[PDB]
Protein backbone atom coordinates (compact mmCIF):
# COMPACT_ATOMS: atom_id res chain seq x y z
CA UNK A 1 0.00 0.00 0.00
CA UNK A 2 1.20 3.50 -0.89
CA UNK A 3 0.23 7.02 0.10
CA UNK A 4 -0.93 9.83 -2.20
CA UNK A 5 2.23 11.87 -2.79
CA UNK A 6 2.93 14.85 -5.03
CA UNK A 7 5.13 14.87 -8.13
CA UNK A 8 6.33 17.49 -10.61
CA UNK A 9 8.77 18.17 -13.43
CA UNK A 10 10.43 21.34 -14.73
CA UNK A 11 12.01 21.64 -18.18
CA UNK A 12 14.29 24.30 -19.70
CA UNK A 13 14.88 24.61 -23.43
CA UNK A 14 16.44 26.75 -26.13
CA UNK A 15 16.05 30.53 -26.42
CA UNK A 16 12.76 31.60 -27.97
CA UNK A 17 13.06 33.30 -31.37
CA UNK A 18 10.06 35.01 -32.95
CA UNK A 19 9.74 34.60 -36.70
CA UNK A 20 7.13 34.88 -39.44
CA UNK A 21 4.71 32.24 -38.13
CA UNK A 22 2.82 31.45 -34.92
CA UNK A 23 5.09 30.72 -31.97
CA UNK A 24 4.84 27.34 -30.24
CA UNK A 25 6.86 26.95 -27.05
CA UNK A 26 6.62 23.17 -27.47
CA UNK A 27 9.22 22.95 -30.24
CA UNK A 28 11.89 24.85 -28.25
CA UNK A 29 12.05 22.31 -25.41
CA UNK A 30 14.97 20.33 -26.84
CA UNK A 31 18.43 21.76 -26.22
CA UNK A 32 21.40 21.62 -28.59
CA UNK A 33 22.53 18.48 -26.73
CA UNK A 34 19.06 17.00 -27.24
CA UNK A 35 17.38 16.19 -23.94
CA UNK A 36 16.58 19.21 -21.78
CA UNK A 37 17.62 19.99 -18.20
CA UNK A 38 14.93 18.26 -16.15
CA UNK A 39 14.58 18.92 -12.42
CA UNK A 40 12.37 16.53 -10.46
CA UNK A 41 13.44 15.80 -6.86
CA UNK A 42 14.27 19.22 -5.44
CA UNK A 43 12.17 21.30 -3.07
CA UNK A 44 10.31 23.87 -5.17
CA UNK A 45 7.97 26.74 -4.32
CA UNK A 46 5.93 28.37 -7.07
CA UNK A 47 3.00 30.74 -7.54
CA UNK A 48 1.21 31.09 -10.89
CA UNK A 49 -1.66 33.51 -11.44
CA UNK A 50 -3.85 33.51 -14.54
CA UNK A 51 -6.56 35.87 -15.77
CA UNK A 52 -8.53 37.03 -18.81
CA UNK A 53 -7.16 40.49 -19.59
CA UNK A 54 -4.58 42.30 -21.71
CA UNK A 55 -1.67 41.48 -19.40
CA UNK A 56 0.05 38.10 -19.74
CA UNK A 57 -0.15 35.43 -17.07
CA UNK A 58 2.95 35.41 -14.87
CA UNK A 59 4.28 32.79 -12.49
CA UNK A 60 7.05 32.73 -9.90
CA UNK A 61 9.29 29.80 -8.95
CA UNK A 62 12.06 29.06 -6.45
CA UNK A 63 14.50 26.14 -6.36
CA UNK A 64 16.97 25.25 -3.61
CA UNK A 65 20.45 23.75 -3.96
CA UNK A 66 20.74 23.59 -7.75
CA UNK A 67 23.83 22.01 -9.29
CA UNK A 68 26.49 24.43 -10.50
CA UNK A 69 26.20 23.26 -14.11
CA UNK A 70 22.53 24.26 -14.40
CA UNK A 71 23.18 27.66 -12.81
CA UNK A 72 26.06 28.15 -15.24
CA UNK A 73 23.76 27.45 -18.18
CA UNK A 74 21.51 30.27 -16.92
CA UNK A 75 24.37 32.67 -16.21
CA UNK A 76 24.73 32.39 -19.96
CA UNK A 77 21.61 33.21 -21.98
CA UNK A 78 20.93 36.07 -19.56
CA UNK A 79 20.41 38.18 -22.69
CA UNK A 80 18.01 35.60 -24.15
CA UNK A 81 14.57 34.17 -23.42
CA UNK A 82 14.79 30.51 -22.47
CA UNK A 83 11.62 28.46 -22.86
CA UNK A 84 10.32 26.75 -19.72
CA UNK A 85 7.50 24.30 -19.01
CA UNK A 86 6.13 23.16 -15.66
CA UNK A 87 4.19 20.00 -14.80
CA UNK A 88 2.42 18.86 -11.64
CA UNK A 89 0.06 16.14 -10.45
CA UNK A 90 -0.21 13.14 -8.09
CA UNK A 91 2.33 10.34 -8.57
CA UNK A 92 0.62 8.97 -11.69
CA UNK A 93 0.42 11.84 -14.16
CA UNK A 94 1.41 15.47 -14.55
CA UNK A 95 -0.64 18.10 -16.36
CA UNK A 96 0.87 21.13 -18.06
CA UNK A 97 0.53 24.04 -15.65
CA UNK A 98 2.53 26.88 -17.25
CA UNK A 99 4.61 27.63 -20.33
CA UNK A 100 6.44 30.82 -21.22
CA UNK A 101 9.77 32.62 -21.17
CA UNK A 102 12.19 33.37 -18.34
CA UNK A 103 11.76 37.12 -17.85
CA UNK A 104 14.04 37.35 -14.80
CA UNK A 105 16.58 35.19 -12.95
CA UNK A 106 18.80 35.84 -9.94
CA UNK A 107 20.88 33.79 -7.51
CA UNK A 108 21.63 34.42 -3.83
CA UNK A 109 23.89 31.95 -1.99
CA UNK A 110 24.32 33.09 1.62
CA UNK A 111 26.27 30.42 3.51
CA UNK A 112 24.16 27.27 3.80
CA UNK A 113 21.68 27.22 0.91
CA UNK A 114 21.47 28.76 -2.56
CA UNK A 115 18.04 29.99 -3.69
CA UNK A 116 17.35 30.55 -7.39
CA UNK A 117 14.49 32.84 -8.44
CA UNK A 118 12.45 33.04 -11.64
CA UNK A 119 9.77 35.25 -13.14
CA UNK A 120 7.98 33.74 -16.14
CA UNK A 121 5.71 35.42 -18.66
CA UNK A 122 3.06 33.78 -20.81
CA UNK A 123 3.72 35.25 -24.25
CA UNK A 124 5.13 38.50 -22.87
CA UNK A 125 7.50 39.03 -25.80
CA UNK A 126 4.80 38.83 -28.49
CA UNK A 127 2.16 40.86 -26.66
CA UNK A 128 4.56 43.76 -26.03
CA UNK A 129 6.36 44.08 -29.39
CA UNK A 130 3.91 43.10 -32.17
CA UNK A 131 3.44 46.35 -34.08
CA UNK A 132 0.64 46.96 -36.58
CA UNK A 133 -0.42 49.53 -39.17
CA UNK A 134 -3.88 48.99 -40.67
CA UNK A 135 -6.83 51.05 -41.88
CA UNK A 136 -10.33 50.48 -43.22
CA UNK A 137 -13.11 52.47 -44.84
CA UNK A 138 -16.80 52.89 -44.10
CA UNK A 139 -18.71 49.71 -44.91
CA UNK A 140 -15.96 47.21 -44.14
CA UNK A 141 -17.26 44.09 -42.34
CA UNK A 142 -16.05 44.05 -38.74
CA UNK A 143 -15.49 40.29 -38.96
CA UNK A 144 -12.63 40.98 -41.40
CA UNK A 145 -10.92 43.51 -39.13
CA UNK A 146 -10.79 41.07 -36.22
CA UNK A 147 -9.11 38.29 -38.21
CA UNK A 148 -6.61 40.71 -39.76
CA UNK A 149 -5.38 41.99 -36.39
CA UNK A 150 -5.09 38.57 -34.74
CA UNK A 151 -2.93 37.17 -37.55
CA UNK A 152 -0.59 40.11 -36.92
CA UNK A 153 -0.19 39.06 -33.28
CA UNK A 154 1.43 35.77 -34.37
CA UNK A 155 -0.17 33.36 -31.90
CA UNK A 156 -2.35 30.27 -32.33
CA UNK A 157 -6.10 30.86 -32.22
CA UNK A 158 -7.46 29.02 -29.19
CA UNK A 159 -11.08 30.05 -29.78
CA UNK A 160 -12.89 32.94 -31.48
CA UNK A 161 -16.53 33.99 -31.79
CA UNK A 162 -16.99 35.94 -35.02
CA UNK A 163 -19.22 39.02 -35.17
CA UNK A 164 -21.52 37.86 -37.95
CA UNK A 165 -22.58 40.51 -40.46
CA UNK A 166 -21.40 43.48 -38.40
CA UNK A 167 -19.97 46.38 -40.40
CA UNK A 168 -17.83 49.36 -39.43
CA UNK A 169 -19.76 52.62 -39.00
CA UNK A 170 -16.74 54.93 -39.34
CA UNK A 171 -13.26 54.76 -40.82
CA UNK A 172 -10.70 53.19 -38.50
CA UNK A 173 -6.93 53.26 -38.18
CA UNK A 174 -4.74 51.09 -35.96
CA UNK A 175 -1.08 51.43 -35.03
CA UNK A 176 1.24 50.63 -32.16
CA UNK A 177 1.09 47.29 -30.40
CA UNK A 178 -1.58 45.01 -31.85
CA UNK A 179 -2.62 43.80 -28.39
CA UNK A 180 -3.51 47.31 -27.25
CA UNK A 181 -5.67 47.97 -30.31
CA UNK A 182 -7.55 44.69 -29.87
CA UNK A 183 -8.13 45.41 -26.17
CA UNK A 184 -9.76 48.70 -27.22
CA UNK A 185 -12.07 46.94 -29.67
CA UNK A 186 -13.18 44.81 -26.71
CA UNK A 187 -14.74 47.73 -24.85
CA UNK A 188 -16.89 48.95 -27.74
CA UNK A 189 -18.21 45.52 -28.77
CA UNK A 190 -18.66 43.57 -25.53
CA UNK A 191 -15.93 41.01 -26.27
CA UNK A 192 -13.20 39.58 -24.04
CA UNK A 193 -9.68 39.20 -25.43
CA UNK A 194 -6.88 37.50 -23.51
CA UNK A 195 -3.94 35.28 -24.37
CA UNK A 196 -3.22 32.29 -22.15
CA UNK A 197 -0.66 29.45 -22.30
CA UNK A 198 0.07 30.57 -25.85
CA UNK A 199 -3.56 30.36 -27.00
CA UNK A 200 -5.61 33.34 -28.17
CA UNK A 201 -9.12 33.44 -26.70
CA UNK A 202 -11.76 35.85 -28.03
CA UNK A 203 -15.20 35.51 -26.42
CA UNK A 204 -18.21 37.66 -25.55
CA UNK A 205 -18.89 39.05 -22.09
CA UNK A 206 -21.88 37.78 -20.13
CA UNK A 207 -22.29 34.60 -22.15
CA UNK A 208 -20.60 31.28 -21.42
CA UNK A 209 -19.88 28.02 -23.22
CA UNK A 210 -21.26 22.11 -21.05
CA UNK A 211 -20.19 21.08 -17.55
CA UNK A 212 -16.50 20.68 -18.32
CA UNK A 213 -15.71 20.44 -14.60
CA UNK A 214 -17.73 19.48 -11.53
CA UNK A 215 -16.75 20.49 -7.99
CA UNK A 216 -17.82 18.40 -5.00
CA UNK A 217 -16.34 16.76 -1.91
CA UNK A 218 -15.39 13.82 -4.12
CA UNK A 219 -13.62 16.22 -6.47
CA UNK A 220 -11.15 17.24 -3.80
CA UNK A 221 -12.88 20.46 -2.81
CA UNK A 222 -11.37 22.42 0.08
CA UNK A 223 -13.88 24.18 2.30
CA UNK A 224 -17.25 25.60 1.40
CA UNK A 225 -17.70 28.20 -1.36
CA UNK A 226 -18.05 31.81 -0.22
CA UNK A 227 -19.43 34.83 -2.10
CA UNK A 228 -16.77 37.37 -3.06
CA UNK A 229 -17.19 40.41 -5.27
CA UNK A 230 -15.33 40.06 -8.61
CA UNK A 231 -13.92 43.61 -8.53
CA UNK A 232 -12.46 45.92 -5.89
CA UNK A 233 -14.92 48.70 -6.76
CA UNK A 234 -18.58 49.26 -7.59
CA UNK A 235 -19.94 50.88 -10.74
CA UNK A 236 -22.90 53.21 -11.11
CA UNK A 237 -25.96 51.46 -12.54
CA UNK A 238 -29.18 52.56 -14.23
CA UNK A 239 -31.29 51.02 -11.45
CA UNK A 240 -24.76 46.82 -21.08
CA UNK A 241 -26.81 45.03 -18.42
CA UNK A 242 -25.39 41.68 -19.57
CA UNK A 243 -21.98 42.37 -18.04
CA UNK A 244 -20.69 40.21 -15.19
CA UNK A 245 -21.05 42.16 -11.86
CA UNK A 246 -21.30 39.07 -9.58
CA UNK A 247 -19.18 36.11 -8.57
CA UNK A 248 -18.09 33.54 -6.01
CA UNK A 249 -14.90 31.81 -4.85
CA UNK A 250 -13.82 28.17 -4.55
CA UNK A 251 -10.61 26.27 -3.79
CA UNK A 252 -9.50 22.83 -4.94
CA UNK A 253 -6.49 20.54 -5.05
CA UNK A 254 -4.01 21.41 -7.78
CA UNK A 255 -5.43 20.66 -11.24
CA UNK A 256 -3.74 22.23 -14.25
CA UNK A 257 -6.46 21.18 -16.70
CA UNK A 258 -8.43 24.39 -16.10
CA UNK A 259 -8.37 27.75 -17.86
CA UNK A 260 -9.84 31.19 -17.08
CA UNK A 261 -12.33 31.10 -19.97
CA UNK A 262 -13.74 27.64 -19.16
CA UNK A 263 -17.02 26.77 -17.42
CA UNK A 264 -17.54 24.86 -14.18
CA UNK A 265 -20.44 23.29 -12.31
CA UNK A 266 -20.61 23.71 -8.53
CA UNK A 267 -22.18 20.72 -6.74
CA UNK A 268 -22.15 21.64 -3.06
CA UNK A 269 -24.80 21.39 -0.34
CA UNK A 270 -25.53 25.14 -0.16
CA UNK A 271 -24.61 26.52 -3.59
CA UNK A 272 -25.60 24.82 -6.85
CA UNK A 273 -25.43 26.10 -10.40
CA UNK A 274 -23.17 26.99 -13.29
CA UNK A 275 -20.47 29.66 -13.28
CA UNK A 276 -17.79 31.12 -15.48
CA UNK A 277 -14.15 31.23 -14.44
CA UNK A 278 -12.40 34.59 -14.17
CA UNK A 279 -9.12 34.05 -12.31
CA UNK A 280 -6.76 31.24 -11.32
CA UNK A 281 -3.91 30.98 -8.84
CA UNK A 282 -1.76 27.87 -8.51
CA UNK A 283 0.35 27.44 -5.39
CA UNK A 284 2.77 24.71 -4.45
CA UNK A 285 5.27 23.63 -1.84
CA UNK A 286 6.84 20.28 -2.65
CA UNK A 287 8.28 19.29 0.73
CA UNK A 288 6.18 21.73 2.77
CA UNK A 289 3.21 23.84 1.73
CA UNK A 290 -0.10 23.71 -0.07
CA UNK A 291 -0.72 21.99 -3.40
CA UNK A 292 -4.04 23.65 -4.24
CA UNK A 293 -5.65 25.91 -6.84
CA UNK A 294 -8.01 28.85 -6.29
CA UNK A 295 -10.78 29.79 -8.73
CA UNK A 296 -12.66 33.07 -8.90
CA UNK A 297 -16.08 32.45 -10.41
CA UNK A 298 -18.42 34.98 -12.01
CA UNK A 299 -22.16 34.67 -12.55
CA UNK A 300 -23.46 34.76 -16.12
CA UNK A 301 -26.66 36.20 -17.59
CA UNK A 302 -26.19 35.96 -21.37
CA UNK A 303 -26.96 33.40 -24.04
CA UNK A 304 -25.34 29.95 -24.02
CA UNK A 305 -22.80 30.47 -26.79
CA UNK B 1 44.94 44.26 22.79
CA UNK B 2 41.73 45.70 21.35
CA UNK B 3 38.92 44.38 19.18
CA UNK B 4 37.78 45.75 15.80
CA UNK B 5 34.81 47.96 16.68
CA UNK B 6 32.66 50.27 14.58
CA UNK B 7 32.57 54.06 14.76
CA UNK B 8 30.57 56.82 13.10
CA UNK B 9 29.74 60.52 13.21
CA UNK B 10 26.72 62.55 12.10
CA UNK B 11 26.78 66.32 11.53
CA UNK B 12 23.97 68.85 11.04
CA UNK B 13 24.56 72.32 9.64
CA UNK B 14 22.86 75.47 8.40
CA UNK B 15 19.96 75.55 5.94
CA UNK B 16 21.02 75.11 2.32
CA UNK B 17 20.47 78.17 0.11
CA UNK B 18 20.88 77.93 -3.66
CA UNK B 19 22.49 80.92 -5.33
CA UNK B 20 24.26 81.85 -8.55
CA UNK B 21 27.19 79.42 -8.26
CA UNK B 22 27.74 75.68 -7.76
CA UNK B 23 26.45 74.39 -4.44
CA UNK B 24 28.87 72.75 -2.01
CA UNK B 25 27.32 71.13 1.05
CA UNK B 26 30.73 71.31 2.75
CA UNK B 27 30.56 75.03 3.50
CA UNK B 28 27.16 74.80 5.25
CA UNK B 29 28.37 72.45 8.00
CA UNK B 30 29.13 75.20 10.53
CA UNK B 31 26.17 76.54 12.50
CA UNK B 32 25.65 80.13 13.64
CA UNK B 33 27.21 79.12 16.97
CA UNK B 34 30.18 77.68 15.08
CA UNK B 35 30.63 73.98 15.78
CA UNK B 36 27.82 71.76 14.53
CA UNK B 37 25.62 69.31 16.42
CA UNK B 38 27.68 66.12 16.36
CA UNK B 39 26.17 62.78 17.39
CA UNK B 40 28.59 59.92 17.99
CA UNK B 41 27.63 57.44 20.74
CA UNK B 42 23.96 56.72 20.09
CA UNK B 43 22.46 53.62 18.51
CA UNK B 44 21.78 54.44 14.86
CA UNK B 45 20.19 52.50 12.00
CA UNK B 46 20.57 53.76 8.45
CA UNK B 47 20.05 52.63 4.86
CA UNK B 48 21.58 54.50 1.92
CA UNK B 49 21.02 53.47 -1.70
CA UNK B 50 22.94 54.92 -4.63
CA UNK B 51 22.56 54.54 -8.38
CA UNK B 52 23.40 56.07 -11.77
CA UNK B 53 20.11 57.51 -13.01
CA UNK B 54 18.06 60.70 -13.10
CA UNK B 55 16.73 60.29 -9.56
CA UNK B 56 18.88 61.45 -6.64
CA UNK B 57 20.41 59.05 -4.15
CA UNK B 58 18.36 58.85 -0.96
CA UNK B 59 19.24 57.52 2.47
CA UNK B 60 17.26 56.80 5.62
CA UNK B 61 18.40 57.16 9.23
CA UNK B 62 17.02 56.51 12.72
CA UNK B 63 18.33 57.70 16.09
CA UNK B 64 17.13 56.69 19.55
CA UNK B 65 16.91 58.83 22.69
CA UNK B 66 18.05 62.18 21.31
CA UNK B 67 18.43 65.11 23.69
CA UNK B 68 15.56 67.59 23.74
CA UNK B 69 17.75 70.47 22.57
CA UNK B 70 18.66 68.76 19.28
CA UNK B 71 15.05 67.81 18.59
CA UNK B 72 14.05 71.41 19.31
CA UNK B 73 16.56 72.66 16.74
CA UNK B 74 14.84 70.43 14.17
CA UNK B 75 11.32 71.38 15.22
CA UNK B 76 12.51 74.74 13.97
CA UNK B 77 13.85 74.80 10.40
CA UNK B 78 11.04 72.42 9.43
CA UNK B 79 10.43 74.82 6.53
CA UNK B 80 14.13 74.74 5.57
CA UNK B 81 16.68 72.27 4.22
CA UNK B 82 19.36 71.53 6.79
CA UNK B 83 22.64 70.15 5.48
CA UNK B 84 23.73 66.77 6.87
CA UNK B 85 26.85 64.64 6.50
CA UNK B 86 27.42 61.06 7.63
CA UNK B 87 30.70 59.26 8.35
CA UNK B 88 31.52 55.63 9.11
CA UNK B 89 34.51 53.33 9.43
CA UNK B 90 36.44 51.15 11.91
CA UNK B 91 37.78 52.88 15.04
CA UNK B 92 40.65 54.59 13.18
CA UNK B 93 39.07 56.60 10.39
CA UNK B 94 35.69 57.51 8.94
CA UNK B 95 34.95 57.97 5.25
CA UNK B 96 32.24 60.26 3.93
CA UNK B 97 29.23 58.08 3.16
CA UNK B 98 26.42 60.53 2.34
CA UNK B 99 25.76 64.25 2.05
CA UNK B 100 22.52 66.02 1.23
CA UNK B 101 19.49 67.78 2.64
CA UNK B 102 16.91 66.69 5.20
CA UNK B 103 13.81 66.10 3.08
CA UNK B 104 11.67 64.74 5.93
CA UNK B 105 11.77 64.50 9.72
CA UNK B 106 9.31 63.15 12.29
CA UNK B 107 9.36 62.18 15.96
CA UNK B 108 7.39 59.48 17.78
CA UNK B 109 7.88 59.10 21.54
CA UNK B 110 5.64 56.29 22.83
CA UNK B 111 6.43 55.70 26.51
CA UNK B 112 9.95 54.29 26.85
CA UNK B 113 11.98 55.41 23.82
CA UNK B 114 11.82 58.24 21.31
CA UNK B 115 12.69 57.39 17.69
CA UNK B 116 13.65 60.15 15.26
CA UNK B 117 13.34 59.55 11.52
CA UNK B 118 15.06 61.16 8.54
CA UNK B 119 14.87 61.03 4.76
CA UNK B 120 17.85 62.59 2.98
CA UNK B 121 18.23 63.52 -0.67
CA UNK B 122 21.46 63.91 -2.62
CA UNK B 123 20.96 67.19 -4.47
CA UNK B 124 17.17 66.82 -4.62
CA UNK B 125 16.53 70.56 -4.52
CA UNK B 126 18.73 71.40 -7.52
CA UNK B 127 17.68 68.46 -9.70
CA UNK B 128 13.96 69.25 -9.29
CA UNK B 129 13.89 73.06 -9.67
CA UNK B 130 16.66 74.08 -12.11
CA UNK B 131 14.72 75.49 -15.06
CA UNK B 132 16.23 76.12 -18.49
CA UNK B 133 15.33 77.78 -21.79
CA UNK B 134 17.80 77.19 -24.62
CA UNK B 135 17.78 76.66 -28.38
CA UNK B 136 20.26 75.92 -31.16
CA UNK B 137 20.33 75.83 -34.95
CA UNK B 138 21.44 73.24 -37.48
CA UNK B 139 25.22 72.86 -37.46
CA UNK B 140 25.83 73.65 -33.80
CA UNK B 141 28.50 71.39 -32.23
CA UNK B 142 26.91 68.99 -29.76
CA UNK B 143 29.87 69.44 -27.41
CA UNK B 144 28.73 73.03 -26.82
CA UNK B 145 25.14 72.05 -25.98
CA UNK B 146 26.26 69.63 -23.27
CA UNK B 147 28.42 72.18 -21.44
CA UNK B 148 25.72 74.86 -21.66
CA UNK B 149 23.08 72.68 -19.99
CA UNK B 150 25.32 71.39 -17.19
CA UNK B 151 26.35 74.91 -16.14
CA UNK B 152 22.64 75.67 -15.79
CA UNK B 153 22.24 72.78 -13.32
CA UNK B 154 24.60 74.54 -10.85
CA UNK B 155 26.60 71.56 -9.59
CA UNK B 156 30.32 70.72 -9.65
CA UNK B 157 31.49 68.63 -12.60
CA UNK B 158 32.74 65.32 -11.23
CA UNK B 159 33.70 63.90 -14.63
CA UNK B 160 32.61 64.40 -18.24
CA UNK B 161 33.47 62.74 -21.55
CA UNK B 162 33.02 65.25 -24.37
CA UNK B 163 31.49 64.22 -27.69
CA UNK B 164 34.35 65.33 -29.94
CA UNK B 165 33.36 66.92 -33.24
CA UNK B 166 29.71 65.84 -33.11
CA UNK B 167 27.23 68.34 -34.55
CA UNK B 168 23.46 68.69 -34.22
CA UNK B 169 21.48 67.34 -37.18
CA UNK B 170 18.27 69.27 -36.43
CA UNK B 171 17.28 72.38 -34.52
CA UNK B 172 16.74 71.77 -30.82
CA UNK B 173 14.87 73.51 -28.02
CA UNK B 174 15.03 72.77 -24.30
CA UNK B 175 12.79 73.94 -21.46
CA UNK B 176 11.56 72.74 -18.11
CA UNK B 177 13.90 71.14 -15.61
CA UNK B 178 17.45 70.91 -16.92
CA UNK B 179 17.91 67.42 -15.47
CA UNK B 180 15.02 66.02 -17.51
CA UNK B 181 16.37 67.46 -20.77
CA UNK B 182 19.84 66.04 -20.12
CA UNK B 183 18.39 62.62 -19.30
CA UNK B 184 16.69 62.67 -22.71
CA UNK B 185 19.96 63.49 -24.49
CA UNK B 186 21.36 60.37 -22.81
CA UNK B 187 19.06 58.00 -24.68
CA UNK B 188 19.88 59.31 -28.16
CA UNK B 189 23.67 59.43 -27.70
CA UNK B 190 24.54 56.43 -25.52
CA UNK B 191 25.67 58.48 -22.51
CA UNK B 192 24.96 58.03 -18.80
CA UNK B 193 24.09 61.08 -16.69
CA UNK B 194 23.67 60.93 -12.92
CA UNK B 195 24.45 63.20 -10.00
CA UNK B 196 25.96 61.67 -6.87
CA UNK B 197 27.23 63.13 -3.57
CA UNK B 198 27.02 66.53 -5.23
CA UNK B 199 29.19 65.57 -8.21
CA UNK B 200 27.97 65.50 -11.81
CA UNK B 201 29.04 62.38 -13.72
CA UNK B 202 28.62 62.13 -17.50
CA UNK B 203 29.98 58.93 -19.05
CA UNK B 204 29.30 56.61 -21.98
CA UNK B 205 27.40 53.34 -21.69
CA UNK B 206 29.24 50.07 -22.27
CA UNK B 207 32.70 51.52 -21.73
CA UNK B 208 34.49 51.76 -18.39
CA UNK B 209 37.44 53.63 -16.90
CA UNK B 210 42.37 50.98 -13.70
CA UNK B 211 41.70 48.58 -10.84
CA UNK B 212 40.59 51.20 -8.33
CA UNK B 213 39.32 48.47 -5.99
CA UNK B 214 40.12 44.78 -5.55
CA UNK B 215 37.77 42.33 -3.84
CA UNK B 216 39.11 39.20 -2.13
CA UNK B 217 38.89 37.35 1.17
CA UNK B 218 41.59 39.70 2.48
CA UNK B 219 39.47 42.66 1.39
CA UNK B 220 36.69 41.73 3.78
CA UNK B 221 34.48 40.02 1.23
CA UNK B 222 31.29 38.40 2.52
CA UNK B 223 30.28 35.20 0.75
CA UNK B 224 30.90 34.19 -2.82
CA UNK B 225 29.74 36.31 -5.78
CA UNK B 226 26.54 35.21 -7.49
CA UNK B 227 25.19 36.10 -10.95
CA UNK B 228 22.14 38.37 -10.86
CA UNK B 229 20.44 40.05 -13.79
CA UNK B 230 20.90 43.86 -13.75
CA UNK B 231 17.25 44.58 -14.64
CA UNK B 232 13.86 43.16 -13.70
CA UNK B 233 12.90 42.62 -17.35
CA UNK B 234 14.35 41.37 -20.62
CA UNK B 235 14.55 43.33 -23.87
CA UNK B 236 14.06 42.09 -27.41
CA UNK B 237 17.35 41.65 -29.27
CA UNK B 238 18.39 41.37 -32.92
CA UNK B 239 19.81 37.87 -32.35
CA UNK B 240 23.25 49.45 -29.67
CA UNK B 241 24.89 46.09 -28.98
CA UNK B 242 27.40 47.77 -26.65
CA UNK B 243 24.81 48.31 -23.92
CA UNK B 244 25.18 46.56 -20.56
CA UNK B 245 22.71 43.57 -20.41
CA UNK B 246 24.73 41.47 -17.90
CA UNK B 247 25.94 41.72 -14.33
CA UNK B 248 26.83 40.10 -11.02
CA UNK B 249 26.50 40.80 -7.29
CA UNK B 250 28.96 41.08 -4.41
CA UNK B 251 28.87 42.13 -0.75
CA UNK B 252 31.59 43.65 1.41
CA UNK B 253 32.18 45.32 4.75
CA UNK B 254 31.14 48.96 4.84
CA UNK B 255 33.45 51.12 2.70
CA UNK B 256 32.27 54.59 1.72
CA UNK B 257 35.12 55.20 -0.73
CA UNK B 258 33.15 53.68 -3.62
CA UNK B 259 30.82 55.24 -6.18
CA UNK B 260 28.38 53.83 -8.76
CA UNK B 261 30.44 54.95 -11.76
CA UNK B 262 33.75 53.47 -10.52
CA UNK B 263 35.45 50.24 -11.61
CA UNK B 264 36.32 47.19 -9.51
CA UNK B 265 38.39 44.04 -9.90
CA UNK B 266 36.98 40.76 -8.57
CA UNK B 267 39.66 38.38 -7.28
CA UNK B 268 37.79 35.29 -6.13
CA UNK B 269 38.38 31.57 -6.68
CA UNK B 270 35.52 31.08 -9.16
CA UNK B 271 34.97 34.48 -10.77
CA UNK B 272 37.81 36.69 -12.00
CA UNK B 273 37.73 39.80 -14.14
CA UNK B 274 36.83 43.47 -14.29
CA UNK B 275 33.35 44.92 -13.82
CA UNK B 276 31.57 48.24 -13.67
CA UNK B 277 29.51 49.31 -10.68
CA UNK B 278 25.81 50.06 -11.15
CA UNK B 279 24.22 50.22 -7.69
CA UNK B 280 25.21 50.61 -4.04
CA UNK B 281 23.38 50.04 -0.77
CA UNK B 282 24.92 50.87 2.60
CA UNK B 283 23.38 49.34 5.72
CA UNK B 284 24.29 49.81 9.34
CA UNK B 285 23.28 48.92 12.87
CA UNK B 286 25.61 50.41 15.46
CA UNK B 287 24.78 48.31 18.51
CA UNK B 288 23.08 45.49 16.59
CA UNK B 289 22.97 44.81 12.86
CA UNK B 290 25.12 44.56 9.78
CA UNK B 291 27.85 47.02 8.80
CA UNK B 292 28.21 45.98 5.16
CA UNK B 293 27.83 47.35 1.63
CA UNK B 294 26.27 45.66 -1.40
CA UNK B 295 27.47 46.26 -4.97
CA UNK B 296 25.63 45.44 -8.17
CA UNK B 297 28.16 44.88 -10.94
CA UNK B 298 27.58 45.02 -14.69
CA UNK B 299 29.70 43.47 -17.43
CA UNK B 300 31.28 45.80 -19.98
CA UNK B 301 31.97 45.35 -23.69
CA UNK B 302 33.10 48.80 -24.90
CA UNK B 303 36.39 50.61 -25.23
CA UNK B 304 38.55 51.41 -22.20
CA UNK B 305 37.78 55.12 -21.90
Amino acid sequence: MRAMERTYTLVIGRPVVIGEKPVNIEKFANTSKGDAYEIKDLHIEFNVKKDNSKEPNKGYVTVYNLSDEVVNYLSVNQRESLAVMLHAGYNGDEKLIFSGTVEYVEDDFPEETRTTKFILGDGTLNLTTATTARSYRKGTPVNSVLNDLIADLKLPKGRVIDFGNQTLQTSMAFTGNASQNLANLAKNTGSTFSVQDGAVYWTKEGSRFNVMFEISEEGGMVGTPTPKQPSSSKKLIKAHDIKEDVGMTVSTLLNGAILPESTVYLNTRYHKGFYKVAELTHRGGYETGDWITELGLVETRGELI
Amino acid sequence: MRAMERTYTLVIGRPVVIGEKPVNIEKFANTSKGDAYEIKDLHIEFNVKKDNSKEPNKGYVTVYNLSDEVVNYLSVNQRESLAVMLHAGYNGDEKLIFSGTVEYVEDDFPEETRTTKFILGDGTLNLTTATTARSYRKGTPVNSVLNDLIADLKLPKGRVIDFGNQTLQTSMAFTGNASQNLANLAKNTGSTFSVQDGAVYWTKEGSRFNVMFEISEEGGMVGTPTPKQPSSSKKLIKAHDIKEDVGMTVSTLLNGAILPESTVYLNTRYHKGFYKVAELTHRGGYETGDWITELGLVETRGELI
Binding site: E55, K58, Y60, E103, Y104, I119, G121, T124, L125, L127, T128, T129 | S231, S232, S233, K235, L236
Partner: peptide, 26 residues
Protein backbone atom coordinates in the same frame (compact mmCIF):
# COMPACT_ATOMS: atom_id res chain seq x y z
CA UNK C 1 12.89 39.69 13.17
CA UNK C 2 12.32 42.75 11.00
CA UNK C 3 14.82 41.09 8.67
CA UNK C 4 12.19 38.54 7.68
CA UNK C 5 9.60 41.23 6.94
CA UNK C 6 11.94 43.45 4.94
CA UNK C 7 12.70 40.55 2.61
CA UNK C 8 9.04 39.96 1.77
CA UNK C 9 8.42 43.67 1.25
CA UNK C 10 11.45 43.80 -1.05
CA UNK C 11 10.19 40.87 -3.09
CA UNK C 12 6.78 42.49 -3.50
CA UNK C 13 8.42 45.71 -4.66
CA UNK C 14 10.45 43.69 -7.16
CA UNK C 15 7.30 42.09 -8.54
CA UNK C 16 5.64 45.48 -8.94
CA UNK C 17 8.67 46.91 -10.74
CA UNK C 18 8.63 43.94 -13.09
CA UNK C 19 4.92 44.42 -13.73
CA UNK C 20 5.43 48.07 -14.66
CA UNK C 21 8.57 47.56 -16.75
CA UNK C 22 8.36 44.61 -19.12
CA UNK C 23 8.93 43.70 -22.74
CA UNK C 24 9.13 46.62 -25.20
CA UNK C 25 11.70 47.55 -27.85
CA UNK C 26 13.01 50.79 -26.23
Amino acid sequence: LRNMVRAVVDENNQFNFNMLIQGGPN
